[PDB]
Structures are given as structure tokens and as C-alpha cells.
């Protein structure tokens, strides 16, 4: 009665969603990852800072 | 900033687990075939009981 | 910097994959019976052929 199919199918849903998203934005994520910290510094907030 | 941090946190996990789709695919296919065998031999078993 | 980045690369993967241990236990146990029964039936067939 293990009926693991539920669990493995859910794992597939997650994994295929993940692959789809990676294809969707993989380039965008790669471009963001080197200079992510800049998100913390808005030019005007830089001066108030 | 924070959303990007979380995105780059989860993105690794996504990559780690994406490769397993096909490893998962054959896994569930075989598993579900096994469950079908269970159901089928169960029907045969019940017919014996009859 | 680079090494640490690699460590924190693995760390998401580490927990994610280690989660699978227990499934693997039952998997290996179950396949053991395949091994055992294959060997047993191999006996039986060899004994018959003799």
C-alpha cells in the first residue's frame, strides 16, 4: 500500500516546474547573480545614506 | 534586493532537483507499473479466493 | 571566497539529497529480495536440469 506514486508525481511536478523556470529565466538569473548587492543602493537613497 | 536574494537562494535547489525529472520519470513509471501488477495480481488473488 | 561559494553551493544540495536516505533504505531492502529470489530460482532450475 506504499502508493509512492503520489510522492514521486509531486516530486516530478516540482522538478519540471523547476526546469521550466530555469529555462525561462536562466540567463536573467545568471546576469543578476554577479551584481545583486546593487539592489540595496538606490541613487537618491545613496545620498541620504 | 530581498526578493533577489531569495531567488538566488532557491535557484540552486531548482538546479539540483531539475536533473532528477527523468530519473524520477523512470522511477514513477516502474513504480506505477508495480502498483498495476499489485492491483492485477490482487484481482487474480481474489478470484482464487472465489 | 570561491571555495566558500562552492560550499554554499553544495549545502542546498546536501540537505536536499540527504533527505532521500530513508527511501533508499526501503529501495535497497526490496531489491535485495530480487537478488535472493533470482538466486533461489537459479538453484531450482539448475537442480531440475540435473
PDB file of C-alpha atoms in Angstrom:
ATOM      1  CA  UNK A   1       0.000   0.000   0.000  1.00  0.00           C
ATOM      2  CA  UNK A   2       3.003   2.322  -0.332  1.00  0.00           C
ATOM      3  CA  UNK A   3       1.354   4.093  -3.277  1.00  0.00           C
ATOM      4  CA  UNK A   4       4.525   6.168  -3.597  1.00  0.00           C
ATOM      5  CA  UNK A   5       3.129   7.403  -6.929  1.00  0.00           C
ATOM      6  CA  UNK A   6       1.660  10.376  -5.092  1.00  0.00           C
ATOM      7  CA  UNK A   7       5.043  11.412  -3.740  1.00  0.00           C
ATOM      8  CA  UNK A   8       7.102  10.778  -6.860  1.00  0.00           C
ATOM      9  CA  UNK A   9       4.492  12.530  -9.002  1.00  0.00           C
ATOM     10  CA  UNK A  10       4.629  15.557  -6.718  1.00  0.00           C
ATOM     11  CA  UNK A  11       8.414  15.446  -6.994  1.00  0.00           C
ATOM     12  CA  UNK A  12       8.006  15.455 -10.764  1.00  0.00           C
ATOM     13  CA  UNK A  13       5.697  18.446 -10.605  1.00  0.00           C
ATOM     14  CA  UNK A  14       8.317  20.306  -8.594  1.00  0.00           C
ATOM     15  CA  UNK A  15      11.243  19.214 -10.762  1.00  0.00           C
ATOM     16  CA  UNK A  16       9.571  20.016 -14.083  1.00  0.00           C
ATOM     17  CA  UNK A  17       8.366  23.361 -12.758  1.00  0.00           C
ATOM     18  CA  UNK A  18      11.983  23.977 -11.760  1.00  0.00           C
ATOM     19  CA  UNK A  19      13.355  23.048 -15.181  1.00  0.00           C
ATOM     20  CA  UNK A  20      10.724  25.217 -16.869  1.00  0.00           C
ATOM     21  CA  UNK A  21      11.606  28.192 -14.677  1.00  0.00           C
ATOM     22  CA  UNK A  22      15.337  27.656 -15.200  1.00  0.00           C
ATOM     23  CA  UNK A  23      14.819  27.695 -18.959  1.00  0.00           C
ATOM     24  CA  UNK A  24      12.529  30.698 -18.517  1.00  0.00           C
ATOM     25  CA  UNK A  25      14.984  32.908 -16.635  1.00  0.00           C
ATOM     26  CA  UNK A  26      18.303  31.048 -16.520  1.00  0.00           C
ATOM     27  CA  UNK A  27      20.056  33.813 -18.421  1.00  0.00           C
ATOM     28  CA  UNK A  28      18.381  36.507 -16.314  1.00  0.00           C
ATOM     29  CA  UNK A  29      19.402  34.863 -13.040  1.00  0.00           C
ATOM     30  CA  UNK A  30      22.962  34.430 -14.294  1.00  0.00           C
ATOM     31  CA  UNK A  31      23.124  38.098 -15.261  1.00  0.00           C
ATOM     32  CA  UNK A  32      21.741  39.232 -11.897  1.00  0.00           C
ATOM     33  CA  UNK A  33      23.833  37.000  -9.630  1.00  0.00           C
ATOM     34  CA  UNK A  34      27.154  38.883 -10.123  1.00  0.00           C
ATOM     35  CA  UNK A  35      25.827  42.314  -9.024  1.00  0.00           C
ATOM     36  CA  UNK A  36      22.858  41.539  -6.773  1.00  0.00           C
ATOM     37  CA  UNK A  37      24.021  43.844  -3.971  1.00  0.00           C
ATOM     38  CA  UNK A  38      23.253  46.906  -6.111  1.00  0.00           C
ATOM     39  CA  UNK A  39      19.587  46.303  -5.287  1.00  0.00           C
ATOM     40  CA  UNK A  40      20.346  47.744  -1.835  1.00  0.00           C
ATOM     41  CA  UNK A  41      21.554  51.146  -3.164  1.00  0.00           C
ATOM     42  CA  UNK A  42      19.028  53.443  -4.825  1.00  0.00           C
ATOM     43  CA  UNK A  43      20.834  56.536  -6.211  1.00  0.00           C
ATOM     44  CA  UNK A  44      18.892  59.031  -4.077  1.00  0.00           C
ATOM     45  CA  UNK A  45      18.907  56.640  -1.141  1.00  0.00           C
ATOM     46  CA  UNK A  46      22.663  56.589  -1.763  1.00  0.00           C
ATOM     47  CA  UNK A  47      22.880  60.288  -0.904  1.00  0.00           C
ATOM     48  CA  UNK A  48      20.514  60.088   2.066  1.00  0.00           C
ATOM     49  CA  UNK A  49      22.669  57.109   3.039  1.00  0.00           C
TER      50      UNK A  49
ATOM     51  CA  UNK B   1      17.101  43.227  -3.027  1.00  0.00           C
ATOM     52  CA  UNK B   2      15.436  40.736  -0.685  1.00  0.00           C
ATOM     53  CA  UNK B   3      13.407  39.033  -3.404  1.00  0.00           C
ATOM     54  CA  UNK B   4      16.565  38.675  -5.497  1.00  0.00           C
ATOM     55  CA  UNK B   5      18.409  37.177  -2.532  1.00  0.00           C
ATOM     56  CA  UNK B   6      15.629  34.632  -2.060  1.00  0.00           C
ATOM     57  CA  UNK B   7      15.558  33.916  -5.795  1.00  0.00           C
ATOM     58  CA  UNK B   8      19.270  33.160  -5.851  1.00  0.00           C
ATOM     59  CA  UNK B   9      18.812  31.071  -2.707  1.00  0.00           C
ATOM     60  CA  UNK B  10      16.124  28.858  -4.246  1.00  0.00           C
ATOM     61  CA  UNK B  11      17.662  28.783  -7.726  1.00  0.00           C
ATOM     62  CA  UNK B  12      20.398  26.350  -6.606  1.00  0.00           C
ATOM     63  CA  UNK B  13      17.780  23.931  -5.274  1.00  0.00           C
ATOM     64  CA  UNK B  14      15.900  24.165  -8.559  1.00  0.00           C
ATOM     65  CA  UNK B  15      19.048  23.248 -10.482  1.00  0.00           C
ATOM     66  CA  UNK B  16      19.892  20.471  -8.036  1.00  0.00           C
ATOM     67  CA  UNK B  17      16.480  18.837  -8.397  1.00  0.00           C
ATOM     68  CA  UNK B  18      15.730  19.530 -12.072  1.00  0.00           C
ATOM     69  CA  UNK B  19      18.148  16.861 -13.298  1.00  0.00           C
ATOM     70  CA  UNK B  20      16.106  14.221 -11.477  1.00  0.00           C
ATOM     71  CA  UNK B  21      12.986  14.672 -13.637  1.00  0.00           C
ATOM     72  CA  UNK B  22      13.975  11.784 -15.887  1.00  0.00           C
ATOM     73  CA  UNK B  23      15.474   9.750 -13.005  1.00  0.00           C
ATOM     74  CA  UNK B  24      12.113  10.459 -11.379  1.00  0.00           C
ATOM     75  CA  UNK B  25      10.280   9.658 -14.612  1.00  0.00           C
ATOM     76  CA  UNK B  26      11.577   6.110 -14.955  1.00  0.00           C
ATOM     77  CA  UNK B  27      11.221   5.734 -11.193  1.00  0.00           C
ATOM     78  CA  UNK B  28       7.499   6.504 -11.101  1.00  0.00           C
ATOM     79  CA  UNK B  29       6.865   4.660 -14.344  1.00  0.00           C
ATOM     80  CA  UNK B  30       8.360   1.492 -12.866  1.00  0.00           C
ATOM     81  CA  UNK B  31       6.687   2.116  -9.506  1.00  0.00           C
ATOM     82  CA  UNK B  32       3.266   2.609 -11.080  1.00  0.00           C
ATOM     83  CA  UNK B  33       3.746  -0.478 -13.233  1.00  0.00           C
ATOM     84  CA  UNK B  34       4.492  -2.317  -9.995  1.00  0.00           C
ATOM     85  CA  UNK B  35       1.300  -0.945  -8.448  1.00  0.00           C
ATOM     86  CA  UNK B  36      -0.622  -2.072 -11.521  1.00  0.00           C
ATOM     87  CA  UNK B  37       0.913  -5.504 -11.041  1.00  0.00           C
ATOM     88  CA  UNK B  38      -0.238  -5.338  -7.436  1.00  0.00           C
ATOM     89  CA  UNK B  39      -3.794  -4.484  -8.474  1.00  0.00           C
ATOM     90  CA  UNK B  40      -3.810  -7.137 -11.189  1.00  0.00           C
ATOM     91  CA  UNK B  41      -2.414  -9.963  -9.086  1.00  0.00           C
ATOM     92  CA  UNK B  42      -4.792  -8.803  -6.355  1.00  0.00           C
ATOM     93  CA  UNK B  43      -7.723  -9.352  -8.682  1.00  0.00           C
ATOM     94  CA  UNK B  44      -6.316 -12.766  -9.582  1.00  0.00           C
ATOM     95  CA  UNK B  45      -5.860 -13.490  -5.865  1.00  0.00           C
ATOM     96  CA  UNK B  46      -9.455 -12.502  -5.132  1.00  0.00           C
ATOM     97  CA  UNK B  47     -10.633 -14.699  -7.997  1.00  0.00           C
ATOM     98  CA  UNK B  48      -8.758 -17.592  -6.430  1.00  0.00           C
ATOM     99  CA  UNK B  49     -10.490 -16.833  -3.132  1.00  0.00           C
ATOM    100  CA  UNK B  50     -13.741 -17.042  -5.057  1.00  0.00           C
TER     101      UNK B  50
ATOM    102  CA  UNK C   1      35.620  33.474  -1.488  1.00  0.00           C
ATOM    103  CA  UNK C   2      35.416  30.907  -4.287  1.00  0.00           C
ATOM    104  CA  UNK C   3      35.698  27.871  -2.032  1.00  0.00           C
ATOM    105  CA  UNK C   4      33.049  29.201   0.352  1.00  0.00           C
ATOM    106  CA  UNK C   5      30.785  29.891  -2.601  1.00  0.00           C
ATOM    107  CA  UNK C   6      31.226  26.259  -3.628  1.00  0.00           C
ATOM    108  CA  UNK C   7      30.406  25.113  -0.101  1.00  0.00           C
ATOM    109  CA  UNK C   8      27.191  27.128  -0.010  1.00  0.00           C
ATOM    110  CA  UNK C   9      26.518  25.802  -3.499  1.00  0.00           C
ATOM    111  CA  UNK C  10      26.647  22.259  -2.165  1.00  0.00           C
ATOM    112  CA  UNK C  11      24.789  22.959   1.076  1.00  0.00           C
ATOM    113  CA  UNK C  12      21.326  23.323  -0.515  1.00  0.00           C
ATOM    114  CA  UNK C  13      22.090  20.187  -2.471  1.00  0.00           C
ATOM    115  CA  UNK C  14      23.463  18.424   0.594  1.00  0.00           C
ATOM    116  CA  UNK C  15      20.266  18.590   2.642  1.00  0.00           C
ATOM    117  CA  UNK C  16      18.033  18.060  -0.379  1.00  0.00           C
ATOM    118  CA  UNK C  17      19.766  14.834  -1.385  1.00  0.00           C
ATOM    119  CA  UNK C  18      20.306  13.576   2.169  1.00  0.00           C
ATOM    120  CA  UNK C  19      16.529  13.741   2.578  1.00  0.00           C
ATOM    121  CA  UNK C  20      16.293  10.716   0.277  1.00  0.00           C
ATOM    122  CA  UNK C  21      18.195   8.330   2.578  1.00  0.00           C
ATOM    123  CA  UNK C  22      15.213   6.503   4.052  1.00  0.00           C
ATOM    124  CA  UNK C  23      13.510   5.883   0.687  1.00  0.00           C
ATOM    125  CA  UNK C  24      16.834   4.421  -0.379  1.00  0.00           C
ATOM    126  CA  UNK C  25      16.796   2.076   2.623  1.00  0.00           C
ATOM    127  CA  UNK C  26      13.475   0.526   1.629  1.00  0.00           C
ATOM    128  CA  UNK C  27      14.547   0.518  -2.009  1.00  0.00           C
ATOM    129  CA  UNK C  28      17.723  -1.437  -1.289  1.00  0.00           C
ATOM    130  CA  UNK C  29      15.913  -3.843   1.025  1.00  0.00           C
ATOM    131  CA  UNK C  30      13.230  -4.506  -1.585  1.00  0.00           C
ATOM    132  CA  UNK C  31      15.738  -5.084  -4.385  1.00  0.00           C
ATOM    133  CA  UNK C  32      17.576  -7.486  -2.112  1.00  0.00           C
ATOM    134  CA  UNK C  33      14.623  -9.849  -2.431  1.00  0.00           C
ATOM    135  CA  UNK C  34      15.029  -9.638  -6.185  1.00  0.00           C
ATOM    136  CA  UNK C  35      18.616 -10.766  -5.710  1.00  0.00           C
ATOM    137  CA  UNK C  36      17.684 -13.521  -3.274  1.00  0.00           C
ATOM    138  CA  UNK C  37      14.764 -14.899  -5.261  1.00  0.00           C
ATOM    139  CA  UNK C  38      16.704 -14.784  -8.521  1.00  0.00           C
ATOM    140  CA  UNK C  39      19.430 -16.821  -6.858  1.00  0.00           C
ATOM    141  CA  UNK C  40      16.883 -19.256  -5.413  1.00  0.00           C
ATOM    142  CA  UNK C  41      15.127 -19.799  -8.734  1.00  0.00           C
ATOM    143  CA  UNK C  42      18.540 -20.237 -10.330  1.00  0.00           C
ATOM    144  CA  UNK C  43      19.075 -23.053  -7.866  1.00  0.00           C
ATOM    145  CA  UNK C  44      15.704 -24.591  -8.683  1.00  0.00           C
ATOM    146  CA  UNK C  45      16.252 -24.524 -12.434  1.00  0.00           C
ATOM    147  CA  UNK C  46      19.773 -25.935 -12.169  1.00  0.00           C
ATOM    148  CA  UNK C  47      18.516 -28.711  -9.896  1.00  0.00           C
ATOM    149  CA  UNK C  48      15.770 -29.536 -12.380  1.00  0.00           C
ATOM    150  CA  UNK C  49      18.161 -29.606 -15.331  1.00  0.00           C
ATOM    151  CA  UNK C  50      20.309 -32.036 -13.368  1.00  0.00           C
TER     152      UNK C  50
END
